[PDB]
Design a protein around this ligand. Sequence first.
Ligand SMILES: NC(=O)c1ccc[n+]([C@@H]2O[C@H](COP(=O)([O-])OP(=O)(O)OC[C@H]3O[C@@H](n4cnc5c(N)ncnc54)[C@H](O)[C@@H]3O)[C@@H](O)[C@H]2O)c1
Ligand SMILES: NC(=O)c1ccc[n+]([C@@H]2O[C@H](COP(=O)([O-])OP(=O)(O)OC[C@H]3O[C@@H](n4cnc5c(N)ncnc54)[C@H](O)[C@@H]3O)[C@@H](O)[C@H]2O)c1
Ligand SMILES: NC(=O)c1ccc[n+]([C@@H]2O[C@H](COP(=O)([O-])OP(=O)(O)OC[C@H]3O[C@@H](n4cnc5c(N)ncnc54)[C@H](O)[C@@H]3O)[C@@H](O)[C@H]2O)c1
Ligand SMILES: NC(=O)c1ccc[n+]([C@@H]2O[C@H](COP(=O)([O-])OP(=O)(O)OC[C@H]3O[C@@H](n4cnc5c(N)ncnc54)[C@H](O)[C@@H]3O)[C@@H](O)[C@H]2O)c1
Lengths: 334, 334, 334, 334
Amino acid sequence: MAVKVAINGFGRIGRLAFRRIQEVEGLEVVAVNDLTDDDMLAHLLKYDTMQGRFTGEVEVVDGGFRVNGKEVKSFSEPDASKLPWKDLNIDVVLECTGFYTDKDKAQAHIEAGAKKVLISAPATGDLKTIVFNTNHQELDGSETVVSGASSTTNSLAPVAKVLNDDFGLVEGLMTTIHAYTGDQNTQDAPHRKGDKRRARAAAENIIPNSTGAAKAIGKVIPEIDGKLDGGAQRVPVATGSLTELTVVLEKQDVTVEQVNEAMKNASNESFGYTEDEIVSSDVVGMTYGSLFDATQTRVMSVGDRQLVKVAAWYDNEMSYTAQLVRTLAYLAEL
Amino acid sequence: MAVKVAINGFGRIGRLAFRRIQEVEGLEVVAVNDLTDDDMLAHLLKYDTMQGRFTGEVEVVDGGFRVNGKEVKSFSEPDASKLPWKDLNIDVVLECTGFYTDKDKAQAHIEAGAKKVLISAPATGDLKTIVFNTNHQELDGSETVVSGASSTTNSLAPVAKVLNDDFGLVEGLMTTIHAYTGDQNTQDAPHRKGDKRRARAAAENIIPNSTGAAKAIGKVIPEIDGKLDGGAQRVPVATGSLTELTVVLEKQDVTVEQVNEAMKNASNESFGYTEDEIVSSDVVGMTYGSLFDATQTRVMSVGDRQLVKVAAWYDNEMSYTAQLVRTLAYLAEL
Amino acid sequence: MAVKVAINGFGRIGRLAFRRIQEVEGLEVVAVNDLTDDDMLAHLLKYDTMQGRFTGEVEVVDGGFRVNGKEVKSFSEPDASKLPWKDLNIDVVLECTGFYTDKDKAQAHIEAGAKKVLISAPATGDLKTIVFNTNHQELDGSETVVSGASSTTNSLAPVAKVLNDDFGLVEGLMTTIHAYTGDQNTQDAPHRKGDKRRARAAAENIIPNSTGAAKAIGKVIPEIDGKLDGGAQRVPVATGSLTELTVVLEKQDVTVEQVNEAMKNASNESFGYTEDEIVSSDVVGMTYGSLFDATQTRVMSVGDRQLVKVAAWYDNEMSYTAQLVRTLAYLAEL
Amino acid sequence: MAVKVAINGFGRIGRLAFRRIQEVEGLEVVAVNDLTDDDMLAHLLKYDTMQGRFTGEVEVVDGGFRVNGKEVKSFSEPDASKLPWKDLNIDVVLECTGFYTDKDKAQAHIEAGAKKVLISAPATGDLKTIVFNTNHQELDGSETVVSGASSTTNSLAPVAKVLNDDFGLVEGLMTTIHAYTGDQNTQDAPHRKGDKRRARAAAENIIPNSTGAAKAIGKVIPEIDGKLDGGAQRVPVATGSLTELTVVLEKQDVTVEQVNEAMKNASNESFGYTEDEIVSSDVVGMTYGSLFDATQTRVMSVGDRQLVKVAAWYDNEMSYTAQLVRTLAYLAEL
Ligand SMILES: NC(=O)c1ccc[n+]([C@@H]2O[C@H](COP(=O)([O-])OP(=O)(O)OC[C@H]3O[C@@H](n4cnc5c(N)ncnc54)[C@H](O)[C@@H]3O)[C@@H](O)[C@H]2O)c1
Ligand SMILES: NC(=O)c1ccc[n+]([C@@H]2O[C@H](COP(=O)([O-])OP(=O)(O)OC[C@H]3O[C@@H](n4cnc5c(N)ncnc54)[C@H](O)[C@@H]3O)[C@@H](O)[C@H]2O)c1
Ligand SMILES: NC(=O)c1ccc[n+]([C@@H]2O[C@H](COP(=O)([O-])OP(=O)(O)OC[C@H]3O[C@@H](n4cnc5c(N)ncnc54)[C@H](O)[C@@H]3O)[C@@H](O)[C@H]2O)c1
Ligand SMILES: NC(=O)c1ccc[n+]([C@@H]2O[C@H](COP(=O)([O-])OP(=O)(O)OC[C@H]3O[C@@H](n4cnc5c(N)ncnc54)[C@H](O)[C@@H]3O)[C@@H](O)[C@H]2O)c1
């Protein structure tokens, strides 16, 4: 009575998805794939700088590793098509490598014998893109390859839904103050992608960087396609981020208290609500996809012209991971 | 015949002001006041974590200390009215303690015998708030107490002025992503002003915080009074900051190129312009009050309806200090 | 039913000791004192940059704050001698302010009505300095004022005791690579105790500093009095530290293996043992006083002459606090 | 007649060497090779997070880039034997990739037409390891491939030389508290060489790591072959490092003053001396290979048995680069 999951890419997302899946009955990681030995894998599962020590027991054994009395088969294969997914009976591949972010590229897992693929990032192609608790009812089981969207898109989507539904979204800009990630360099150095900002010492700088999140929000919410854009600022915290959205609305005479009350009313397991004066380190490890922060809501009015600004915290690691694993369980049921 | 300056608070701004004044002909620092002794004062002047070693000879003498063959007397007197300003024929106090940011309170320096005071911060009371090269001309010689505004206000004013003069400023919101400062706690601990966010480990968090830069811009540019608002996020870089501004403009079919060009045309020694993809560490020690970054200009257009975003860097330490010492020499000569 | 505890100084060690007491039956914190209000105290209890969110619920109430249904009384009285310790029937004060670290200073609490005082630091005067599971046995219940030693002494003593007992300590030198603490400055600035290195930006430097842990070890282990000395390097992690000790011994032809086994054989709840290649963030929140790392044992031999190096991790915050609370329970039950 | 230098690997050491060479007449960098494009090489030369802005002007041109009016040719070739060193009359290659750290591999540069190769690290094979002003006089002219030693070795050699000549070195152990480097990971992730410690987030951790600097000291000072060993602790400063050495000496009754005078007596342009209480950010950019800090000197005596401890600072970046360049000029001169 268990969905067989494979994780491809035992990185920040793959390993935390593993932690998360240890709490979900009939979701079972049976295999992992990465570019390293089992020793490295076990070690990175047990010890995690920002996320804390793994909550149980990990042992390096023959096939891969032993976790809480259950065998996880391990692989070191960089080509997905060469994976023994048929032999292992893989129900869902959690695609967390970063190198398969596309319907066609990700098809490789289907070939290998897996039935479904959920990608842990935006992907290109004829795919559904899903934010759990905003978007997931759009799934139905016809789907073969699915995208779980991005960390920022999951912090942003439910905020933007309330704004448009209650106020009419005219247009908006976003800046996310985002923790630095592994694709940024440790020291100033050539960047494999040619990006002169990601090339810079990650933990020593405020770094402007591109994001597709707001420009691509149409994918999870069609009613506001092309109404939002924005960028990121990468700063020196290792995880935990903040999304800031500035919008023009159709409804006039909107107040700070109307905005906060309408977000609080939309709150759920995915969309948290707070009025405490928290900081980034306080959301590290949290499982809400987006935590709306009422202390940061601002309204600028001049005559009949208004600018409305809001902000929501997210552990770009764990908040995204928890949303990804919610979508996985729902996807798997269908 | 040289202007005689006393620096109250030999802190980050006060010691960098000391460095600047060594470049300005006919300004001399004859005295310094703080809460410590000469061993500490000299040492902090010689070694500076973010701004580099001070170049000349610094020796502790009987007066206080000697810098490059020049005597600076020093005192350790928390009560400014007891300072010997009359005896030393002080022309201007640079008030950099953070404890006299008020016209009435700053009057303690005038009672002690200084002719004028220039405060290194926003200040309450019946006084002028001055951004060099935006409104320093508003000074006419009859001022005894003057505020040199804030780092953020200095980064924001020339940008906001061009937006209004060239496009018609309807309204706008600001975020400044600001390096952490000395009023933040090293570790989570009770905060002296009761701020629950400045209570937190400065170097381990993105911390939201208030700033009056946009709200009180009318003091510097009266014609856009009440048109801007916004706040700050304090992040773990030790100096160097970015101001992001989102606005609606009367001019209707705005392009990135029009905005970038209007800014370049306003550049001078206070207001720089760059087209390079820089990060915060690149502005450390710069002497522009504000460096416009043309790579971060965006125009979001939905039908006839546009939002415009711009960003300008500032070394909140050295950019602010270079501006303060310019306003200082100008005020002295009046 | 429970020993009634008051915490003087609700700082890092105060708050963590509060959290730790929640989990030790027979101990109850009935009051807290600091220099702040209840809004701030409840906030710092609930939220913690490195140590994570408080598990229970916390609420400001009229005399203080309620934690998990229990009322804690709070006060903000800088002079210990005025605290209503008599009417609260306080059994022990945990003295965690940093301002009463001497026997006669701490006596103020006794005069205010506490039965006993345990100071969260080295302390001067006629008192016992106690590291739990190395020498707490020297307490006989009759003590009025006791020192819980330092984080570094607690990391060091069990290690030094094994080296001496099993190999005969001749002499040795220590360096502790130690997380930065609240008594360092956020930015370069005058330091209160005139210390020119603690003056420096804590999160941006390696900073040599003094410590007495090794030189005063004799207070904890009399038989090696005078044999150890050494220092600290403060570095940019917010908590988590490592004690390295290089010794000369009486035993000859000593091997890495004999040293590791001796250390494992002495392991208990205060002295941990590991062979995992962990790093500082891995010890954040651990409740061992000292965590011996067998991967860092080195022996240098030249002919008949050897130097033996070892290293033991500690969370200078939580390791020390768990040692404190054990000594507290022991002192109270006598 | 100016020496013609090609730099292989335009990274931290290669870029800094390029900058340092602009300060040294007789030496001309004519070519640069790496794995990126001209836009990125030029940008990373112009901007540098820790070492500050390049003083020169830099322009991308058809062959490469122009620096102050002189053309530097640039190549994008991973196989060094395919490089056009004979066409360009390369006198010395500065091999700074990390990928040719071997006599036989480095020979690819000579095959390709360069007269000599100087490797920016320790190297395998039958070649000499040079720390300038300690053993550079061992270069007799016949050499074609040479090692510039490591940053730690350059910090340690002049210190160990004095201890041995003046006091007779019996044995010693070393710990270097070292800035994180580019081969450590930004976030916890699998590591290229299977190192479970360089795997972990560089800027969030104290990370033990192995160094060959002490153990291989004998290649630089043969008289002390085998008498030193030790390791490293990598910490969250982006550059700037400290070497502590703990030693047994033949000379008895050694004092702090004798050790300090003896080090002051050996100072030169490679080996600096200070009595100021500095921290790591104060050495960033310094051109001494080793800066002895007299404030950190300690002598432990127990009867007739002493341990002596010293510490020397180095900018692992610029201290080593300035040494490498001195060795370059010397090696070129014969
Ligand atoms: N904040 C975040 O870290 C964040 C949030 C949401 C989504 N994501 C997305 O999740 C994906 C993974 O992100 P991450 O943060 O874990 O990065 P990461 O580098 O930690 O993880 C990538 C892992 O995949 C492995 N890998 C790389 N190529 C492989 C291959 N071809 N076959 C098998 N394994 C391979 C690597 O060894 C590495 O461990 C990315 O697409 C990223 O954009 C990241
Ligand atoms: N990014 C920035 O640091 C920045 C930018 C612009 C303006 N400012 C403003 O300038 C002022 C100083 O800021 P800072 O960053 O230099 O802080 P700081 O703490 O480094 O400097 C304060 C100095 O004043 C001394 N001092 C405090 N009270 C005193 C008193 N009563 N009498 C004499 N000396 C006293 C302190 O010992 C300290 O050296 C503040 O008002 C701040 O708002 C700071
Ligand atoms: N690594 C560590 O942080 C650590 C480890 C072991 C021991 N210690 C020791 O424990 C003590 C506290 O350390 P900390 O890191 O928690 O410091 P901290 O600054 O976080 O806490 C000190 C607290 O005492 C307060 N205070 C309360 N009442 C006071 C009063 N009555 N008079 C004066 N000050 C008062 C301050 O407001 C503050 O909250 C110090 O002795 C320190 O050396 C600290
Ligand atoms: N503190 C230090 O950074 C330090 C000090 C002294 C010595 N070193 C040594 O110097 C060397 C370089 O270290 P770094 O810190 O500058 O590293 P780095 O990563 O910044 O630089 C290496 C550069 O070489 C390039 N490269 C890699 N392979 C190449 C190839 N085959 N052909 C051409 N270019 C290639 C990379 O793109 C990169 O720009 C290493 O041996 C290192 O151990 C480092």
